[PDB]
């Protein structure tokens, strides 16, 4: 199973559990036709660390950008070698059964490459969603429609 894409992004906690903070972590993302998984990146050795998350591609119903937070820390506010792994201001979402996984890219070009490839892979799903939430689901509700359920029907036609 070939690795379609491999990048270092910033991600928001999916807060699956109740006892989970709303924090961001740098992770190494790999995209195969079967799964989108992320690991801790071992910077020193220059390799991927322990798998920290995974999502079966057949469970993805939607992939799209997402309106930026209005007050982003410097870490997410809009030389290359360093900035491309320190600054992640272009967010996008990977929607599936367990709410949305938010991912922050370093450049707009990269987010485009990913969003384009994730669409080719999900093209094979039997029931993609026609709608989605354009804004972050932050603080118990969707800032784009105010619905509460993470997996609440998207408040906007694709
Ligand atoms: O700090 P802490 O390590 O407890 O934060 C967790 C971290 O945000 C996890 O993300 P990853 O390290 O990328 O795995 C969160 O899990 P996910 O976003 O689902 O991957 C974790 O919360 P949940 O597991 O959703 O319960 C945070 O506690
Ligand atoms: Zn919405």
Curated annotation (Swiss-Prot):
UniProt region (Inositol-(1,3,4,5)-tetrakisphosphate 1-binding), positions on chain: 11-23
UniProt modified residues of type N-acetylalanine: 1
UniProt-annotated location(s): Cytoplasm; Cell membrane; Nucleus; Membrane raft
Residues that, per the record, bind 1D-myo-inositol 1,3,4,5-tetrakisphosphate: 25, 27, 38, 52
PTM annotation (Phosphotyrosine): residues: 39
Outcome (variant: residue 40 to K): No effect on phosphorylation of GTF2I
ZnF (Btk-type) ranges: 125-158
Binding site for Zn(2+): 133, 144-145, 155
Function text: Non-receptor tyrosine kinase indispensable for B lymphocyte development, differentiation and signaling. Binding of antigen to the B-cell antigen receptor (BCR) triggers signaling that ultimately leads to B-cell activation. After BCR engagement and activation at the plasma membrane, phosphorylates PLCG2 at several sites, igniting the downstream signaling pathway through calcium mobilization, followed by activation of the protein kinase C (PKC) family members. PLCG2 phosphorylation is performed in close cooperation with the adapter protein B-cell linker protein BLNK.
Protein's name in the database: Tyrosine-protein kinase BTK
Record organism: Homo sapiens (Human)
Segment of the intact protein contained: 2 to 168 of 659
């Amino acid at each position: 199973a070939a690795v379609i894409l491999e990048s270092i992004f910033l991600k928001r906690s999916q807060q699956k559990k109740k006892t989970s903070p709303l924090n961001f972590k740098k992770r190494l993302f790999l995209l195969t036709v079967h799964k989108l998984s992320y690991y801790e990146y071992d910077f020193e050795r220059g390799r991927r660390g322990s798998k920290k998350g995974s999502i079966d591609v057949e469970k993805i119903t939607c992939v799209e950008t997402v309106v930026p937070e209005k007050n982003p820390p410097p870490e997410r506010q809009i030389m290359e070698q360093i900035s491309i792994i320190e600054r992640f201001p272009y967010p996008f979402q990977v929607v599936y059964d367990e709410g949305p996984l938010y991912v922050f890219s370093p450049t707009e070009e990269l987010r485009k490459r990913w969003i384009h490839q994730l669409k080719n892979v999900i093209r094979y799903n039997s029931d993609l969603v026609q709608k989605y939430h354009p804004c972050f689901w932050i603080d118990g509700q969707y800032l784009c429609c105010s619905q509460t359920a993470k997996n609440a029907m998207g408040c906007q036609i694709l």
